[PDB]
Design a binder for this molecule. Structure first.
Ligand SMILES: [Cl-]
Ligand SMILES: [Cl-]
Ligand SMILES: [Cl-]
Ligand SMILES: [Cl-]
Ligand SMILES: [Cl-]
Ligand SMILES: [Cl-]
Ligand SMILES: [Cl-]
Ligand SMILES: [Cl-]
Ligand SMILES: [Zn+2]
Ligand SMILES: [Zn+2]
Ligand SMILES: [Zn+2]
Lengths: 587, 587, 587
């Protein structure tokens, strides 16, 4: 019944059994350990020098080993392909699908009965969970946790968030280029990932909300001894999960994805969460669209008072009660599917029914929330088939300026300024010839999965310095790229199809009038449908949208099969491989 | 001039520089270390629990770190995707190209000025060297080394080789199925890779002969303290190589490949060496064909008395003088390109001019060799466009039986028995209905890069047990797969194109007369050219050669671009990416 | 000039040089590394499973190694004998002198040119510094740092301090015996030592004030990446200190001890600091008495607002500016000997001249201090030749009750209740027959270096529960033992000579009137000098003071040479060994 026995204890094939035993005993494992029906537990290790965010997982694996051994298993630790958001060029999103490919190969083709997935930095959570979904042997995820709180002259400084606030304090002469480095260094005072509500905190929280972590695990800061005890408890549990055959497909049900969509809104989750969870849904065989994110999550209020939306940081999120406290608030409104089973063998409802808010400054009750209507809205129209807007970081300046007109409520119109990539933007934003005022919507195209190739976090553009000196902070930002989860920009992201894939962004000229109507969920460049096909005819004639040639073999290989962000930016030909450890391997 | 400064010390982009610094300082590296022009040295780490052969590299990296620090560099250790020959299913050759892809992405897209490649198990050497070739920043390779000698009742037992000798001592009732495990376990008495002249010993020796290791490094057994001192010396040297900009393209010249072809013959190298070095040649932009292997290497004699061809093991190879002693014997005949520069900054001729044979039982002089004419012969004909034959392991039983006829010298004819994969063979070999005698040539088809998908080491087939009980040991083996380097079978391997790619093997019927003529280098099934196209017409009509559907996304992705073993079984669309760290990234 | 060459590079003795080289090369060190005049740097490692407080030093040593290698040295890491305050029975003070003995043997008898001392838990700081003082090769100390702040329902909880507050919240029915464990576990949320102003924080701060750490090093919490960068900087510096021959005797001058006495008062240092620094003074050959502590430190105000005296914890102490900020406040009053050289090669005055208070809630200015007159007073009389009183934790309840009488200001009298050890006290304190009221001074005898043997932290006795239920919290505590540095008890400690050494405590009967006069610095049992010798005659006649027989060989060996706490509780025959690396070895 244990698939590892086909390698280490196969009486029908004496020759090959002796071959695997010989190699896997050369650092002291005994024949009896490998031939006594003990679960072989992989640790999918994401920590290294090259991934500082996840590096503490090298130490946490020691506690995992204690739990596995004690429970009767054997650990085989092995590496996941490196991903690092602050490091990989041109973009670390290029590499989520590559790490997925390799991890599928290890889980499928080696004698592993179960796996501990070490998650942390932005894309390691989906890469690990996607591969676990495809192979579908029992799997449990362990967050490494955020860095400790940053401290600067008595105030909390958040990683990532302090950058966008210092990039406006530097571009206004109020901060030099040397003290800019000190204010940023203060925000990374320990090991762990981003300590704001960035993509990493989002995805690790959602991994718990999905049922893939022990309750309370996601929020624990990396240097806390609580993280080390949880690592041990997961080592014990994954062995029992093997005996129970508790698989990702048993846990990652539609109602688990619904719980995660609603927790995402309540915690202020990143605009990257729909990309990664739609990816995961497809790889486990559950249907989940961008429209589901609006349907289940748009009207959920924001409860977690964390930067960039709020004031506090990861340590405070943990002390306040973390994911269980958030789930418990949603349970009080009947907005949690409480019977969804989780890795610890209990339902999310049983795990969270007694979770209280332990700090009311950091986590708000549902009825007195931090902000209402904090989910995602999907915008459609001639600009793109889908894009989403981060409603949780709309400020009162943005609300009072743009969303306050009696002629057209919850809607605005303005002039469009288009940049073709982040380099084009960084060379034209401060250019006074552009005449960027209070009625301008900046566009960023060519930054999607195929165009960049990435996709890259380049949409949260800053206003020109002649507008930031007058007092205009945030401006409408729309693009076919992404943004950092730590961004407090209420941008219109993830436009699908991208420009390089025939999206309407490809034919937008700077100076065209555009109308973003959040009420009717539309996003159109105000032009003729006749002139629309004329711009597209001239495009196909002069060769399609222009974007850089591939620079590596993987760039080229991935560009030929990758789909759009709307559906997870997955390798499209990989999705047919379902439950491959048990369906012999699938089409 | 150091490419790492674009990440850690880029005054034009203050924002992003602060971002990389923040993350890479969170385990204690100082700003000064990262912003003082110090070479950033990657360690491409191949050791893990999942790769027992290479696992000691986790410990060797400590000595590498000492050398890099002392020389003024900074180490960033990161993982290579796991490959393990005794472990990966269905074949570890499926994963050489996947590890290549990921390592290209790390070297190209991270702030690395140079890299230490940790090599060992069969495919880690080419995977690491291929990726280093594509990116072409300074790189040095470190072998982990073989396991210690096996000992069984006073005799040396070799890993891999003891299996083929116990698989014939078990299939003849002279060894049970429990004592079979003990005789094999004795051959793996420490950490390290195979201690015979297998693929790992071959490829690690060739890496030194190519100029990519310090002289004397390849042969050192893994547990020897000499291995730890060499690791430190390489850490020092890679930093100097960065200052000198000594690149793989400077070292991997045509004449380096010629030196390796000739060292391969002298050491008894594996039939997998042409696949991996033709791959490496293409990835560095040097021309190298299977015909070059015959042209430069066929007539070189066998000098190393190691199992499977000979008697001794890896420790003895090291004590006898290792690669330098072999090179020095070839230098005495003027058969080494002595001016080829190597990683230590000296030519291979200067490194080896004083290397002596220290044990004459283990390494023979050129003039009194162990065997003559020990290289590869290329066979062509209607069976395949190319295949090679391992001349160094032809026994006197094989020579006296097959290669001793006055009607046709150095040639034989016989009946063909075809198996479609290793499973078909293991179900028909002992079948008495086959009537396999002294005039039978067994064929193995469907085992190539696309068919298996692998390719897999399945050609060294054993004779039926009714022939092994009479006294017939080795039989002619021909196929479109590979064999283990530890095999003493003089097989005809690496047939290109494979059956699944339209090779002549696809239309061979069991019972057809075949003629292998080593004199004229031909290999034909004795049939009509008219009937040849008829069998092929019926094939294309009934759908092509049959082989398993892909089981994973990577299997499918790789099958669409992988080429044939004749030209390295590389990803064909990857070869256009040349010197991509300096040519901006290449087409 | 490097003493390590007598081992590794001694041309006069070829035989023995080859012997040491052979052994120390067996894990890969080269002959050239050991025979090229490179400083051999020991790391005196105090971390282990058995010493949780110091265990992170096992990880910090990696950064130390980077700095030593980079600077041109070689690291030899070796262990210090385990000491652990929360762990060793019957007392961890028994083992400070044993760790000292062993570390002297390593530094003196091995080829070490310099040493990094890893300090942390209470007694590792003096044990390491004492041994470094005796041998006197260049030495630098590295604190591991405190644990992170404890958090319980929105409030800071300190390790050790939360115990004394929960031992009074448990002994009053307001806390059960299970929730008692949770409130204490919250105070230890990471690796590191006690996060209050306990003995560890005291001694590590004083090690910096003495000049034995890089400026700013003492206060850094253990999990902060700042700790890892400082570890690296010390590895670099110790190599330069070897070239400069900057020795403990150059740094630990009388004026360094004066700086530490005054910093001790300003930070609220533990009553154990005089024991350990008088020990260190004697081992380096500087004169320092308990009277010096009063003379130089009594009138210094308390500036650090840390538990137990104040509100904050170790992280806040670091953010506020740590030791340099405290030194800078004392410099502003001319109370620092600013020209005392420190390990980094600069004077303490140059290192601290620009150190500012960064959080005014945590560190107070000298002129608006937290409390005045916060040092130690020495009490003498017929009870003991010396004892000290912790003036920084005298509460207003203690001040208003006891130190507020017009008949005798700053003085009190009361009834004496004597317990013979902690076991006797724990069996009699709550006994209602004792009738303990507002005019009772509790005594603890038999707890000194010889009696316990310890000495043990047993003097901070709690009031009976019938007094704690009425409202009487703190009572006068006097004894020949110690107390925890985390104690907010204004006790009279360290009585010398102890009862078991003939101190006046040995003849004190319960019920005797005693008069503690802090004004005249006297402490007498109000009895006749005639009756005093009568009680002592009856003692010597009936055999001396009673105390347990030795339980281990070390207990017995130490009892025969150990002196009293007044003079450091050192091995008295060890003090004559001065500068033994250079004076051939001393008498
Ligand atoms: Cl690993
Ligand atoms: Cl905090
Ligand atoms: Cl619902
Ligand atoms: Cl690694
Ligand atoms: Cl041997
Ligand atoms: Cl030649
Ligand atoms: Cl140690
Ligand atoms: Cl003074
Ligand atoms: Zn990250
Ligand atoms: Zn191997
Ligand atoms: Zn301690």
């Amino acid at each position: 019944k244990l698939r590892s026995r086909a390698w280490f204890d196969n009486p029908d094939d004496v020759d090959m059994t002796a071959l695997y035993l010989e190699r896997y005993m050369n650092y002291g494992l005994s024949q009896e350990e490998l031939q006594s029906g003990r679960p072989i537990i992989g640790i999918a290790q994401t920590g290294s020098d090259l991934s500082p965010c996840n590096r503490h997982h090298l130490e946490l694996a020691k506690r995992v080993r204690d739990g596995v051994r004690e429970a009767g298993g054997i650990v085989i630790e092995f590496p996941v392909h490196p991903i690092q958001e602050t490091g990989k060029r041109p973009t670390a999103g290029l590499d989520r699908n590559l790490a997925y490919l390799g991890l599928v190969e290890v889980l499928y083709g080696y004698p592993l009965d179960g796996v501990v997935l070490t998650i942390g930095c932005d894309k390691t959570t989906p890469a690990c969970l996607m591969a676990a979904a495809t192979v579908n042997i029992p799997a449990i995820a362990l967050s490494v946790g955020p860095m400790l709180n940053g401290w600067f002259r008595g105030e909390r400084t958040g990683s990532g968030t302090i950058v966008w606030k210092a990039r406006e304090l530097l571009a206004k002469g109020e901060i030099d280029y040397q003290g800019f480095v000190k204010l940023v260094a203060s925000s990374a005072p320990s090991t762990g990932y981003c300590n704001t509500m960035g993509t990493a905190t989002t995805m690790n929280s959602l991994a718990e909300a999905l049922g893939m972590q022990l309750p309370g695990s996601a929020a624990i800061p990396a240097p806390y001894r609580d993280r080390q005890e949880v690592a041990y408890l997961m080592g014990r549990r994954i062995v029992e999960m093997v005996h129970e055959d508790l698989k990702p497909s048993d846990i990652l049900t539609k109602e688990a994805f619904i719980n995660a969509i609603r927790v995402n809104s309540a915690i202020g989750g990143s605009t990257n969460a729909p990309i990664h969870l739609n990816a995961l849904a497809r790889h486990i065989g559950v249907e989940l669209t961008v429209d589901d994110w609006q349907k289940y999550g748009e009207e959920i209020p924001l409860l977690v008072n964390l930067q960039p939306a709020g004031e506090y940081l990861g340590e405070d999120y943990y002390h306040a009660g973390g994911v269980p406290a958030v789930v418990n608030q949603l349970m009080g409104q009947g907005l949690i599917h409480e019977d969804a089973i989780t890795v610890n063998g209990k339902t999310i409802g049983e795990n969270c029914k007694n979770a209280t808010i332990e700090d009311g400054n950091v986590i708000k009750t549902y009825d007195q929330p931090l902000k209402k209507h904090a989910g995602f809205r999907v915008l459609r129209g001639n600009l793109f088939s889908s894009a989403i807007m981060k409603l949780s970081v709309i400020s009162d300046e943005f609300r009072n300026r743009y969303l306050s007109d009696a002629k057209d409520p919850n809607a605005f119109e303005g002039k469009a300024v288009v940049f073709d990539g982040p380099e084009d933007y960084h060379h034209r934003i401060d250019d006074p010839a552009l005449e960027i005022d209070e009625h301008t919507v900046l566009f960023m195209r060519g930054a999607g999965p195929i165009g960049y190739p990435g996709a890259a976090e380049v949409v949260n553009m800053r206003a020109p310095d002649y507008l930031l000196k007058k007092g205009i902070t945030s401006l409408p930002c729309i693009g076919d790229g992404r943004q950092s989860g730590t961004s407090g920009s209420p941008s219109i992201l993830n436009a699908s199809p991208e420009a390089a894939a025939g999206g309407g962004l490809a034919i937008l000229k700077t100076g065209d009038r555009v109308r973003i109507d959040l009420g009717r969920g539309t996003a159109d460049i105000l032009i003729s449908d006749e002139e629309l096909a004329e711009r597209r005819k001239a495009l196909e004639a002069v060769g399609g949208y222009k974007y850089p040639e591939s620079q590596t073999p993987w760039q080229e290989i991935q560009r030929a099969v990758i789909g759009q962000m709307e559906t997870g930016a997955v390798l499209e030909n990989a999705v047919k491989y379902q439950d491959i450890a048990h369906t012999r391997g699938l089409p």
